[PDB]
Each structure stands twice: as structure tokens, then as C-alpha cells.
Design a binder for these strands. Structure first.
Ligand SMILES: Nc1nc2c(ncn2[C@H]2C[C@H](O)[C@@H](COP(=O)(O)NP(=O)(O)OP(=O)(O)O)O2)c(=O)[nH]1
Ligand SMILES: [Mn+2]
Ligand SMILES: [Mn+2]
Length: 430
DNA sequence: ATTATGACGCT
DNA sequence: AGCGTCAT
């Protein structure tokens, strides 16, 4: 009872940009705004592969991983923007720079953890304590939460979406105890006020809209963020977890969408996250290992301890290209030329990183895939990265992979390469 | 012939 | 160190 810690110590937010690459292209080209729009990589094969989709286009069934030609079948007026091509490959620099814009705004409010190109976690615990001090026990007006949903409300005792949103927010605010500066529900609420301000700042200063989740840990904040996209934020309280999880497929929780989640379902004979509560911690550890078992035991009760890492910058800088089917690299000249192309992009990005961020990478990782191997990587080899020079990096990458070529002929490469990947790692302050 | 990235756990 | 998983 009283000693049963409930995982309510922290206020954590997850901010995710809506259809990010599409918004980057819509800002640059106003003709794409408020239209069914998607971003594609390449064009020759089936129109290019879609990697981002505006919400207008999603209404027609357009999705990521779809070929543009098939997307056009579902939505003939779909507009398309293509990723830049440089040195023969897709170049994502425009989106990385737009990402830095958003991350720097978020960092004004709190230290953030960059989780991907378009989303970051925020630990708002201290910021919430400060705003609570300033409030002096003043209640929180619904006017301060103009885009916030309270998951699970309204309940009990109505036709429009905004009306439902405001109804739930009213029930939530009416139930709040604002004289208690340590009430977790109040703390989450103040956290949501701050996230409204953060999202207002992002849209004002970049033009980009985003959604957000506010809860007590990273997994619940991420799940909350997805409940009311786009351009809205969602508060998931500790109390909302039993009902939320009672019908939540296990695969919806981050890290359970793959083989481990399928094994949870198959071994335990369950479907929903809430069903996990009926097992003891030792039972879960016996099936899924000590770490996973402890994590599942806490997480099905809404509890997770993973910290928001103080990290605004990526830990690695990498360059990769697939060479599918008949485009696979089958000569040594080919392999050297593409290693050089990747290495020149890497050099450019690394040099800009050293200038911006006062650090230098010290290890080069070379990954290849060989024809007939279904795995992502057929082989990974590291070597030293001592100079930001593309010719040196590509020569070293060739040296560490050249023993892969089973061809007796010096010129041919067998079996052909269907992927090259260069990744700079192990940064040190410079 | 999804592709181009990341992060992180395991041994 | 090199490999596998998860994401998207
Ligand atoms: N190169 C590449 N980029 C990708 C891929 N998948 C996603 N991206 C890029 C394109 C995406 O714009 C961006 C962010 O990924 P999300 O947050 O998963 N999707 P979004 O922000 O579009 O929509 P939502 O409103 O549902 O959050 O990453 C991929 O497979 N390859
Ligand atoms: Mn997004
Ligand atoms: Mn994202």
C-alpha cells in the first residue's frame, strides 16, 4: 500500500513533429500546403518509395513504404516532393537542418533527449516545480490548455470533436487538487501547460506543427503522443492506465512491436497490455529474461524508469545505400566508386559537425550486405578514423571489406554487394 | 526492388 | 568487437 511506489515522481513529455519531411517541403513550397502530399526517395522504380505522408493524403490510404505509383492509384491528385540526390544517393541534409531548428527551440525549456530526427523527450519535473511556485496555488484555466486531450475523459454523464475535448478537459480540471504542490495529477497538468507553450514556440518560430504526449515516463508519453495526432497533445495520467491498457494490443508499446512482443503473446496466451498484470515478476523474468521481465512487470502497471538522457545531438553519423536486384555492385571499380561517394558525403557531414559541435569521431564502421543474405548487415568491421578525408576513409573501408570478395578475379566482385554503409562513431571533444 | 538512417542489447 | 533487434 503506502510503500508501493507508483512511478509518479517525474513529468516526461514526448514531442513528435507531424508528417515531418512533408512539413519541411510544404514550408519551402506553399503550393503543397493543405493538400494530399507525400515525400519520396528516388523515382525510376515504381515512382519512388514514400517515406512521409500528409494527413490529407492519409485519408486516401496513402502510407509510408508505399510505391508512389500505387499511392497515385489511391489518390490521383497526390502531390509529391522528392528527397535531394547528391553523389548518386539520397541526401537528407535539409531535414537534418530543420530538425536542429526544432531541437534548439525545445532545449530552451528543458534539457532534451533526441530520440530521432523529428522527436525528443523532455524531462519537465523541475520546470513544473518552478511554475507551481509561481502559480501560488492558483487553479489552472482551460484557456491555458487549448489543444490538450485528457485520455479517458469525458466519462459517465457531445457530437463534435472539439466539444468532447473540452468536456474531458473540464472534468479533469474540476477534479484537480491545486493546494497540493506534490499531487502528480497537478504536476502533469502544469507540465501540459508548459508543453502547450513549447509547441506554440515551435510553430511560431519554424512554421512546423507537432503533437505531444505528457505522462510520468517515456513509454507512456510516447503512447500518449499518438492518441490525438495531428497538432494536438494528450495527457495520460497514472489513473488512466488500467482502462487504457485493458484494450491495448501489446505491439503498440514501444519495443514490443517485434519478436519479443510476439513471444509475450504466444507464450502467455494474452492479447492486451493489461493482461500482463496477472503474472508475477519472477514469472515474467522466467520467460523473457531478468531485464525484460522486470520491465514488463512495471510497465503493465504504468511504471518505467528509463531516464531522459541529456543528449540533443546524434551519437553516430552514417551514410548508407542499397543496390537492389540488378544494380548490385559486381566489380571492384564499382565498389570503390560508391565507397568514395558515401565517404565524400560522410566527410562533408563530419566536417560540419566538428565545426558546429566541438567534437571529432574516432571510429569508422563499415557494413555491407551480400546478395542472397536476408539480414540487414552481412558484415560489420571497424577501423580507426584519424582524418576527415574521404579518400582515406574510402580506402580504409575497402581495406577492411576486401577479404569478402570470393571472386578469384581481381576485377570482379562476387557475390555482388547489395548495400554499403559507412558510419562514424565514438566521438571525443575537440 | 522499401530505403536511409538511428539507438541499443547481447555475448 | 561483431551481431541482432526495434524503429520508421
Ligand atoms: N530515409 C527514411 N526516412 C524515414 C523513414 N521513415 C520515416 N522517415 C522520415 C520521414 C518522416 O517525416 C520522419 C519522422 O518519422 P515519423 O515520426 O515516424 N513520421 P511522420 O513525422 O512523417 O508522421 P507522424 O505525424 O505520424 O509522426 O522520418 C525511412 O524508412 N527512411
Ligand atoms: Mn513525426
Ligand atoms: Mn518520430
Amino acid at each position: 500500500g503506502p510503500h508501493m511506489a507508483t512511478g509518479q515522481d517525474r513529468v516526461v513529455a514526448l514531442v513528435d513533429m507531424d508528417c515531418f519531411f512533408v512539413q519541411v517541403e510544404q514550408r519551402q513550397n506553399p503550393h503543397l500546403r493543405n493538400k494530399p502530399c507525400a515525400v519520396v526517395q528516388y523515382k525510376s522504380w515504381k515512382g519512388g518509395g514514400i517515406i512521409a505522408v500528409s494527413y490529407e493524403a492519409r485519408a486516401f490510404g496513402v502510407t509510408r513504404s508505399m510505391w508512389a505509383d500505387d499511392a497515385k492509384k489511391l489518390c490521383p491528385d497526390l502531390l509529391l516532393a522528392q528527397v535531394r540526390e547528391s553523389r548518386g544517393k539520397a541526401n537528407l541534409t535539409k531535414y537534418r537542418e530543420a530538425s536542429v531548428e526544432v531541437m534548439e527551440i525545445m532545449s530552451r525549456f528543458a534539457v532534451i533527449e533526441r530520440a530521432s530526427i523529428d522527436e525528443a523527450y523532455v524531462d519537465l519535473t523541475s520546470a513544473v516545480q518552478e511554475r507551481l511556485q509561481k502559480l501560488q496555488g492558483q487553479p489552472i484555466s482551460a484557456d491555458l490548455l487549448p489543444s490538450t486531450y485528457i485520455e479517458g475523459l469525458p466519462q459517465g454523464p457531445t457530437v463534435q470533436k472539439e466539444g468532447m475535448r473540452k468536456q474531458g478537459l473540464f472534468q479533469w480540471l474540476d477534479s484537480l487538487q491545486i493546494d497540493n504542490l506534490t499531487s502528480p495529477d497537478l504536476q502533469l497538468t502544469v507540465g501540459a501547460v508548459i508543453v502547450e507553450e513549447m509547441r506554440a514556440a515551435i510553430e511560431r518560430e519554424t512554421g512546423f506543427q507537432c503533437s505531444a504526449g505528457i505522462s510520468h515516463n517515456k513509454v507512456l508519453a510516447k503512447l500518449a503522443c499518438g492518441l490525438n495526432k495531428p497538432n494536438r497533445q494528450t495527457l495520460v495520467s497514472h489513473g488512466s492506465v488500467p482502462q487504457l491498457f485493458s484494450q491495448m494490443p501489446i505491439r503498440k508499446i514501444r519495443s514490443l512491436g517485434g519478436k519479443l512482443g510476439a513471444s509475450v503473446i504466444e507464450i502467455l496466451g494474452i492479447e492486451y497490455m493489461g493482461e500482463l498484470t496477472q503474472f508475477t515478476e519472477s514469472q515474467l523474468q522466467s520467460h523473457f529474461g531478468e531485464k525484460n521481465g522486470s520491465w514488463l512487470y512495471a510497465m503493465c502497471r504504468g511504471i518505467e524508469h528509463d531516464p531522459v538522457k541529456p543528449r540533443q545531438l546524434p551519437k553516430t553519423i552514417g551514410c548508407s545505400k542499397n543496390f537492389p536486384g540488378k544494380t548490385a555492385l559486381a566489380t571492384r571499380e564499382q565498389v570503390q566508386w560508391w565507397l568514395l561517394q558515401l565517404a565524400q558525403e560522410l566527410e562533408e557531414r563530419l566536417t560540419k559537425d566538428r565545426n558546429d559541435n566541438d567534437r571529432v569521431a574516432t571510429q569508422l564502421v563499415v557494413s555491407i550486405r551480400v546478395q542472397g543474405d536476408k539480414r540487414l548487415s552481412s558484415l560489420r568491421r571497424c577501423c580507426a578514423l584519424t582524418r576527415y578525408d574521404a579518400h582515406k576513409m574510402s580506402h580504409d573501408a575497402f581495406t577492411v571489406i576486401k577479404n569478402c570478395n570470393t571472386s578469384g578475379i581481381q576485377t570482379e566482385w562476387s557475390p555482388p554487394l547489395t548495400m554499403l554503409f559507412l558510419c562514424a562513431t565514438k566521438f571525443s571533444a575537440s
